[PDB]
PDB file of C-alpha atoms (C1' of nucleotides) in Angstrom:
ATOM      1  CA  UNK A   1    -202.479 -11.771 123.158  1.00 23.94           C
ATOM      2  CA  UNK A   2    -200.849 -10.290 120.044  1.00 24.29           C
ATOM      3  CA  UNK A   3    -200.082 -12.137 116.813  1.00 23.08           C
ATOM      4  CA  UNK A   4    -196.735 -13.895 116.497  1.00 24.23           C
ATOM      5  CA  UNK A   5    -194.336 -14.117 113.513  1.00 25.63           C
ATOM      6  CA  UNK A   6    -193.789 -17.880 113.678  1.00 23.07           C
ATOM      7  CA  UNK A   7    -194.196 -20.514 110.996  1.00 21.25           C
ATOM      8  CA  UNK A   8    -195.529 -22.879 113.642  1.00 18.98           C
ATOM      9  CA  UNK A   9    -197.064 -26.228 112.765  1.00 20.31           C
ATOM     10  CA  UNK A  10    -198.037 -29.305 114.750  1.00 20.11           C
ATOM     11  CA  UNK A  11    -199.523 -32.616 113.688  1.00 18.87           C
ATOM     12  CA  UNK A  12    -202.602 -32.046 115.839  1.00 16.56           C
ATOM     13  CA  UNK A  13    -203.304 -28.829 113.934  1.00 18.48           C
ATOM     14  CA  UNK A  14    -202.409 -30.239 110.523  1.00 18.95           C
ATOM     15  CA  UNK A  15    -204.891 -33.038 111.206  1.00 17.97           C
ATOM     16  CA  UNK A  16    -207.723 -31.088 112.823  1.00 18.15           C
ATOM     17  CA  UNK A  17    -208.047 -28.722 109.897  1.00 19.90           C
ATOM     18  CA  UNK A  18    -207.666 -31.656 107.489  1.00 21.62           C
ATOM     19  CA  UNK A  19    -210.212 -33.605 109.534  1.00 20.13           C
ATOM     20  CA  UNK A  20    -212.452 -30.572 109.106  1.00 23.92           C
ATOM     21  CA  UNK A  21    -211.914 -29.872 105.402  1.00 23.18           C
ATOM     22  CA  UNK A  22    -212.241 -33.550 104.500  1.00 23.63           C
ATOM     23  CA  UNK A  23    -215.738 -33.465 106.017  1.00 24.99           C
ATOM     24  CA  UNK A  24    -216.750 -30.153 104.453  1.00 24.68           C
ATOM     25  CA  UNK A  25    -216.229 -31.464 100.910  1.00 25.06           C
ATOM     26  CA  UNK A  26    -218.816 -34.195 101.451  1.00 25.08           C
ATOM     27  CA  UNK A  27    -221.435 -31.989 103.119  1.00 24.34           C
ATOM     28  CA  UNK A  28    -220.998 -29.427 100.324  1.00 20.28           C
ATOM     29  CA  UNK A  29    -221.761 -32.051  97.671  1.00 20.79           C
ATOM     30  CA  UNK A  30    -224.688 -33.361  99.734  1.00 21.17           C
ATOM     31  CA  UNK A  31    -226.213 -29.886  99.926  1.00 21.25           C
ATOM     32  CA  UNK A  32    -226.302 -29.679  96.127  1.00 22.05           C
ATOM     33  CA  UNK A  33    -227.920 -33.062  95.467  1.00 20.79           C
ATOM     34  CA  UNK A  34    -230.719 -32.011  97.815  1.00 21.03           C
ATOM     35  CA  UNK A  35    -230.523 -28.811  95.794  1.00 21.55           C
ATOM     36  CA  UNK A  36    -230.796 -31.157  92.790  1.00 17.95           C
ATOM     37  CA  UNK A  37    -234.110 -32.546  94.071  1.00 21.53           C
ATOM     38  CA  UNK A  38    -235.249 -28.983  94.832  1.00 24.78           C
ATOM     39  CA  UNK A  39    -207.704 -34.937  96.320  1.00 24.59           C
ATOM     40  CA  UNK A  40    -205.804 -32.881  98.881  1.00 22.97           C
ATOM     41  CA  UNK A  41    -209.357 -32.131 100.191  1.00 25.80           C
ATOM     42  CA  UNK A  42    -208.406 -28.553 101.103  1.00 24.34           C
ATOM     43  CA  UNK A  43    -206.792 -27.542  97.817  1.00 22.73           C
ATOM     44  CA  UNK A  44    -210.075 -28.858  96.416  1.00 21.89           C
ATOM     45  CA  UNK A  45    -211.935 -26.611  98.865  1.00 19.58           C
ATOM     46  CA  UNK A  46    -210.520 -23.197  97.899  1.00 18.92           C
ATOM     47  CA  UNK A  47    -211.350 -23.757  94.203  1.00 17.87           C
ATOM     48  CA  UNK A  48    -214.849 -22.560  95.102  1.00 13.79           C
ATOM     49  CA  UNK A  49    -213.568 -19.109  96.097  1.00 14.91           C
ATOM     50  CA  UNK A  50    -211.238 -16.307  94.935  1.00 17.27           C
ATOM     51  CA  UNK A  51    -208.526 -15.423  97.538  1.00 15.71           C
ATOM     52  CA  UNK A  52    -208.810 -11.582  97.770  1.00 13.02           C
ATOM     53  CA  UNK A  53    -205.055 -10.785  97.891  1.00 14.26           C
ATOM     54  CA  UNK A  54    -205.694  -7.023  98.041  1.00 13.52           C
ATOM     55  CA  UNK A  55    -207.877  -6.889 101.151  1.00 13.56           C
ATOM     56  CA  UNK A  56    -208.392  -9.430 103.893  1.00 12.55           C
ATOM     57  CA  UNK A  57    -211.970 -10.036 102.831  1.00 11.72           C
ATOM     58  CA  UNK A  58    -213.344  -9.821  99.356  1.00 14.07           C
ATOM     59  CA  UNK A  59    -215.455  -6.697  99.809  1.00 18.77           C
ATOM     60  CA  UNK A  60    -217.733  -5.744  96.925  1.00 17.94           C
ATOM     61  CA  UNK A  61    -219.820  -2.787  95.805  1.00 19.53           C
ATOM     62  CA  UNK A  62    -223.496  -3.365  96.420  1.00 24.17           C
ATOM     63  CA  UNK A  63    -225.622  -0.895  94.409  1.00 24.09           C
ATOM     64  CA  UNK A  64    -224.945  -2.895  91.254  1.00 23.20           C
ATOM     65  CA  UNK A  65    -226.025  -6.128  89.470  1.00 24.08           C
ATOM     66  CA  UNK A  66    -224.443  -8.306  92.201  1.00 22.51           C
ATOM     67  CA  UNK A  67    -227.884  -8.263  93.942  1.00 19.41           C
ATOM     68  CA  UNK A  68    -230.279 -11.209  94.474  1.00 18.70           C
ATOM     69  CA  UNK A  69    -233.932 -11.836  95.312  1.00 19.14           C
ATOM     70  CA  UNK A  70    -234.143 -13.299  98.806  1.00 17.97           C
ATOM     71  CA  UNK A  71    -234.654 -17.056  98.678  1.00 17.24           C
ATOM     72  CA  UNK A  72    -238.021 -17.938 100.160  1.00 15.67           C
ATOM     73  CA  UNK A  73    -237.838 -21.543 101.348  1.00 17.59           C
ATOM     74  CA  UNK A  74    -235.861 -21.888 104.568  1.00 18.84           C
ATOM     75  CA  UNK A  75    -234.240 -24.640 106.616  1.00 20.27           C
ATOM     76  CA  UNK A  76    -235.589 -26.765 109.436  1.00 25.21           C
ATOM     77  CA  UNK A  77    -234.156 -29.151 112.012  1.00 27.29           C
ATOM     78  CA  UNK A  78    -235.704 -32.142 110.245  1.00 24.89           C
ATOM     79  CA  UNK A  79    -233.966 -31.340 106.961  1.00 25.49           C
ATOM     80  CA  UNK A  80    -230.660 -30.368 108.575  1.00 26.38           C
ATOM     81  CA  UNK A  81    -230.108 -33.565 110.546  1.00 24.19           C
ATOM     82  CA  UNK A  82    -230.838 -35.645 107.431  1.00 22.22           C
ATOM     83  CA  UNK A  83    -228.590 -33.598 105.128  1.00 21.20           C
ATOM     84  CA  UNK A  84    -225.646 -33.958 107.535  1.00 21.88           C
ATOM     85  CA  UNK A  85    -226.208 -37.612 108.415  1.00 17.84           C
ATOM     86  CA  UNK A  86    -224.659 -39.366 105.398  1.00 20.70           C
ATOM     87  CA  UNK A  87    -221.554 -37.114 105.618  1.00 19.03           C
ATOM     88  CA  UNK A  88    -221.475 -37.894 109.339  1.00 17.73           C
ATOM     89  CA  UNK A  89    -221.649 -41.604 108.474  1.00 20.17           C
ATOM     90  CA  UNK A  90    -218.599 -41.697 106.204  1.00 21.61           C
ATOM     91  CA  UNK A  91    -216.629 -39.468 108.564  1.00 20.01           C
ATOM     92  CA  UNK A  92    -216.825 -41.759 111.606  1.00 20.19           C
ATOM     93  CA  UNK A  93    -214.347 -44.378 110.350  1.00 22.07           C
ATOM     94  CA  UNK A  94    -211.476 -41.881 109.796  1.00 21.21           C
ATOM     95  CA  UNK A  95    -212.551 -40.376 113.150  1.00 21.27           C
ATOM     96  CA  UNK A  96    -211.204 -43.440 114.935  1.00 20.22           C
ATOM     97  CA  UNK A  97    -207.877 -43.328 113.084  1.00 21.56           C
ATOM     98  CA  UNK A  98    -207.224 -39.719 114.105  1.00 20.84           C
ATOM     99  CA  UNK A  99    -206.273 -38.846 117.653  1.00 19.50           C
ATOM    100  CA  UNK A 100    -209.067 -38.645 120.187  1.00 18.34           C
ATOM    101  CA  UNK A 101    -208.684 -34.925 120.927  1.00 20.75           C
ATOM    102  CA  UNK A 102    -208.709 -34.128 117.227  1.00 22.16           C
ATOM    103  CA  UNK A 103    -211.739 -36.420 117.321  1.00 22.09           C
ATOM    104  CA  UNK A 104    -212.989 -34.507 120.371  1.00 18.54           C
ATOM    105  CA  UNK A 105    -212.449 -31.327 118.337  1.00 16.56           C
ATOM    106  CA  UNK A 106    -214.569 -32.334 115.331  1.00 19.26           C
ATOM    107  CA  UNK A 107    -217.254 -33.643 117.641  1.00 17.13           C
ATOM    108  CA  UNK A 108    -217.232 -30.305 119.414  1.00 14.10           C
ATOM    109  CA  UNK A 109    -216.838 -27.896 116.475  1.00 16.76           C
ATOM    110  CA  UNK A 110    -219.702 -29.491 114.540  1.00 19.43           C
ATOM    111  CA  UNK A 111    -222.341 -28.575 117.153  1.00 16.75           C
ATOM    112  CA  UNK A 112    -221.192 -24.976 117.527  1.00 16.58           C
ATOM    113  CA  UNK A 113    -218.424 -24.698 120.154  1.00 20.14           C
ATOM    114  CA  UNK A 114    -215.410 -23.006 118.600  1.00 18.74           C
ATOM    115  CA  UNK A 115    -212.000 -23.832 120.163  1.00 17.40           C
ATOM    116  CA  UNK A 116    -211.014 -21.872 123.253  1.00 20.09           C
ATOM    117  CA  UNK A 117    -207.415 -23.147 123.153  1.00 17.32           C
ATOM    118  CA  UNK A 118    -205.378 -20.786 120.967  1.00 17.35           C
ATOM    119  CA  UNK A 119    -202.748 -22.574 118.894  1.00 17.64           C
ATOM    120  CA  UNK A 120    -199.759 -20.441 119.922  1.00 17.30           C
ATOM    121  CA  UNK A 121    -200.081 -21.235 123.633  1.00 19.48           C
ATOM    122  CA  UNK A 122    -199.388 -24.966 123.979  1.00 23.87           C
ATOM    123  CA  UNK A 123    -196.485 -25.005 121.531  1.00 21.71           C
ATOM    124  CA  UNK A 124    -193.855 -24.995 124.391  1.00 22.03           C
ATOM    125  CA  UNK A 125    -190.868 -25.032 121.982  1.00 19.65           C
ATOM    126  CA  UNK A 126    -188.809 -22.671 124.299  1.00 15.47           C
ATOM    127  CA  UNK A 127    -187.813 -20.605 121.302  1.00 16.79           C
ATOM    128  CA  UNK A 128    -191.373 -19.810 120.341  1.00 16.26           C
ATOM    129  CA  UNK A 129    -191.917 -19.199 124.064  1.00 14.77           C
ATOM    130  CA  UNK A 130    -189.615 -16.214 123.754  1.00 14.64           C
ATOM    131  CA  UNK A 131    -191.064 -15.220 120.400  1.00 11.64           C
ATOM    132  CA  UNK A 132    -194.505 -15.126 122.032  1.00 11.13           C
ATOM    133  CA  UNK A 133    -192.917 -13.261 124.953  1.00 12.32           C
ATOM    134  CA  UNK A 134    -191.155 -10.645 122.863  1.00 15.21           C
ATOM    135  CA  UNK A 135    -194.050  -9.737 120.581  1.00 16.66           C
ATOM    136  CA  UNK A 136    -196.434  -9.236 123.473  1.00 15.65           C
ATOM    137  CA  UNK A 137    -193.688  -7.024 124.898  1.00 13.36           C
ATOM    138  CA  UNK A 138    -193.069  -5.477 121.481  1.00 15.60           C
ATOM    139  CA  UNK A 139    -196.624  -4.226 121.046  1.00 14.61           C
ATOM    140  CA  UNK A 140    -197.004  -3.364 124.725  1.00 19.49           C
ATOM    141  CA  UNK A 141    -194.438  -0.600 124.622  1.00 20.15           C
ATOM    142  CA  UNK A 142    -195.661   0.664 121.249  1.00 21.16           C
ATOM    143  CA  UNK A 143    -199.044   0.740 122.968  1.00 21.64           C
ATOM    144  CA  UNK A 144    -197.438   2.713 125.814  1.00 18.68           C
ATOM    145  CA  UNK A 145    -195.441   4.978 123.438  1.00 17.31           C
ATOM    146  CA  UNK A 146    -192.164   3.796 124.981  1.00 17.12           C
ATOM    147  CA  UNK A 147    -189.843   3.815 122.016  1.00 16.21           C
ATOM    148  CA  UNK A 148    -186.283   3.337 123.270  1.00 17.41           C
ATOM    149  CA  UNK A 149    -187.427   0.117 124.929  1.00 14.64           C
ATOM    150  CA  UNK A 150    -189.572  -1.089 122.024  1.00 14.09           C
ATOM    151  CA  UNK A 151    -186.560  -0.500 119.808  1.00 13.66           C
ATOM    152  CA  UNK A 152    -184.569  -2.890 121.974  1.00 15.16           C
ATOM    153  CA  UNK A 153    -187.197  -5.621 121.793  1.00 12.54           C
ATOM    154  CA  UNK A 154    -187.504  -5.185 118.036  1.00 13.89           C
ATOM    155  CA  UNK A 155    -183.748  -5.389 117.482  1.00 15.15           C
ATOM    156  CA  UNK A 156    -183.669  -8.600 119.502  1.00 15.81           C
ATOM    157  CA  UNK A 157    -186.708 -10.155 117.834  1.00 15.82           C
ATOM    158  CA  UNK A 158    -185.374  -9.885 114.274  1.00 17.65           C
ATOM    159  CA  UNK A 159    -182.195 -11.727 115.271  1.00 17.49           C
ATOM    160  CA  UNK A 160    -183.992 -14.786 116.633  1.00 17.25           C
ATOM    161  CA  UNK A 161    -184.392 -17.295 113.769  1.00 18.03           C
ATOM    162  CA  UNK A 162    -187.813 -18.018 112.351  1.00 17.22           C
ATOM    163  CA  UNK A 163    -189.367 -14.550 112.585  1.00 20.30           C
ATOM    164  CA  UNK A 164    -191.467 -13.227 109.741  1.00 22.15           C
ATOM    165  CA  UNK A 165    -192.243 -10.109 107.688  1.00 19.90           C
ATOM    166  CA  UNK A 166    -195.210  -9.427 110.024  1.00 17.27           C
ATOM    167  CA  UNK A 167    -193.181  -7.873 112.818  1.00 19.77           C
ATOM    168  CA  UNK A 168    -190.613  -6.535 110.337  1.00 19.12           C
ATOM    169  CA  UNK A 169    -192.028  -3.725 108.301  1.00 17.51           C
ATOM    170  CA  UNK A 170    -195.263  -2.886 110.073  1.00 17.16           C
ATOM    171  CA  UNK A 171    -193.919  -1.086 113.106  1.00 15.55           C
ATOM    172  CA  UNK A 172    -191.315   0.910 111.260  1.00 14.99           C
TER     173      UNK A 172
ATOM    174  C1'  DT B   1    -182.458 -19.715   6.171  1.00 13.46           C
ATOM    175  C1'  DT B   2    -182.902 -16.961  11.450  1.00 15.68           C
ATOM    176  C1'  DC B   3    -184.763 -16.590  17.171  1.00 17.40           C
ATOM    177  C1'  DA B   4    -184.079 -17.764  21.474  1.00 13.93           C
ATOM    178  C1'  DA B   5    -181.894 -20.066  26.011  1.00 15.58           C
ATOM    179  C1'  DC B   6    -178.247 -22.472  28.246  1.00 12.12           C
ATOM    180  C1'  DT B   7    -173.013 -20.322  29.345  1.00 11.89           C
ATOM    181  C1'  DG B   8    -168.008 -20.122  30.963  1.00 11.14           C
ATOM    182  C1'  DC B   9    -165.037 -16.635  31.634  1.00 15.37           C
ATOM    183  C1'  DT B  10    -162.938 -10.180  35.008  1.00 15.52           C
ATOM    184  C1'  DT B  11    -157.216 -10.769  40.567  1.00 14.36           C
ATOM    185  C1'  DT B  12    -152.672 -11.003  42.074  1.00 17.78           C
ATOM    186  C1'  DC B  13    -150.761 -11.724  48.434  1.00 17.36           C
ATOM    187  C1'  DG B  14    -152.911 -10.827  52.495  1.00 20.25           C
ATOM    188  C1'  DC B  15    -156.371  -9.240  55.202  1.00 19.95           C
ATOM    189  C1'  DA B  16    -161.252 -10.328  57.439  1.00 17.08           C
ATOM    190  C1'  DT B  17    -190.313 -30.890  70.734  1.00 18.27           C
ATOM    191  C1'  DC B  18    -186.805 -31.274  74.812  1.00 15.10           C
ATOM    192  C1'  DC B  19    -184.828 -29.936  79.428  1.00 15.73           C
ATOM    193  C1'  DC B  20    -183.575 -26.991  83.669  1.00 14.44           C
ATOM    194  C1'  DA B  21    -184.983 -24.058  87.929  1.00 13.30           C
ATOM    195  C1'  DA B  22    -188.415 -21.758  92.142  1.00 17.97           C
ATOM    196  C1'  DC B  23    -190.793 -21.667  96.425  1.00 18.54           C
ATOM    197  C1'  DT B  24    -194.005 -23.492  99.536  1.00 17.47           C
ATOM    198  C1'  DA B  25    -196.487 -27.852 100.800  1.00 19.71           C
ATOM    199  C1'  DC B  26    -196.681 -31.924 102.761  1.00 22.60           C
ATOM    200  C1'  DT B  27    -194.809 -35.885 104.157  1.00 25.15           C
ATOM    201  C1'  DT B  28    -192.270 -39.419 105.708  1.00 26.04           C
ATOM    202  C1'  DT B  29    -188.335 -41.116 108.690  1.00 27.01           C
ATOM    203  C1'  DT B  30    -188.287 -42.949 113.294  1.00 24.79           C
ATOM    204  C1'  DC B  31    -187.486 -42.329 118.426  1.00 21.94           C
ATOM    205  C1'  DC B  32    -188.962 -41.058 122.780  1.00 24.31           C
ATOM    206  C1'  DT B  33    -192.868 -39.796 126.889  1.00 26.69           C
ATOM    207  C1'  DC B  34    -197.223 -41.593 129.532  1.00 28.57           C
ATOM    208  C1'  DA B  35    -201.741 -42.763 130.145  1.00 27.41           C
ATOM    209  C1'  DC B  36    -206.422 -46.007 130.430  1.00 30.16           C
ATOM    210  C1'  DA B  37    -209.098 -49.825 131.429  1.00 29.99           C
ATOM    211  C1'  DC B  38    -209.065 -54.032 134.412  1.00 33.33           C
ATOM    212  C1'  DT B  39    -208.725 -56.589 139.458  1.00 32.44           C
ATOM    213  C1'  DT B  40    -208.239 -58.414 145.450  1.00 34.27           C
ATOM    214  C1'  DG B  41    -208.281 -57.207 149.394  1.00 35.14           C
ATOM    215  C1'  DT B  42    -209.443 -53.691 153.182  1.00 34.93           C
ATOM    216  C1'  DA B  43    -212.441 -50.558 155.405  1.00 35.07           C
ATOM    217  C1'  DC B  44    -217.244 -48.642 157.324  1.00 35.77           C
ATOM    218  C1'  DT B  45    -220.623 -50.220 158.820  1.00 34.25           C
ATOM    219  C1'  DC B  46    -224.779 -53.930 157.396  1.00 37.56           C
ATOM    220  C1'  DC B  47    -228.606 -57.271 159.965  1.00 37.32           C
ATOM    221  C1'  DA B  48    -228.458 -61.253 162.363  1.00 37.24           C
TER     222       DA B  48
END
DNA sequence: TTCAACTGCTTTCGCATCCCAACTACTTTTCCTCACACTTGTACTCCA
């Protein structure tokens, strides 16, 4: 349930985000050439946005000049399936080089259908399996205001290698 | 018959642009663990 302090990575997750952010670069360019009639591939993505670094989300005052008139002309299904088609053409040949469940992912996440499999569950590393165990027992006693026990879990969690700042300072 | 620059000399011992590095990333090195499609009979009756 609770967040874990692991620097966990797998090839199926390194691909499935890269399989996603490779695609998004093409469909972003395609949206602006139809707006013109009217290469890490993820390092290239975040150059469109400013990472907030103070808050989670870049919140912004509103009663100011950051306002806009509402755009009138809206989407339809006929324009959406023709603006995605040419990015869906070029994507299909790297879709057969990637693994089929990464390929099952991008087929599923492009029609809606967010993933229901959370990444810290199938990792099965036996050391992360205790790091997932301890942090769900760490928060559970802090939830239950049991402090001599949640001390003991927290003293044991910081000694297991690979744990982060996340557990460290927050519940001081 | 004079003005104005070129001129060597003050002491006496001893003191005294190129490289490197940081951290976080991404990647390669491979080795190990199984599945996915194909096929002949046999089984349960099928129509003669």
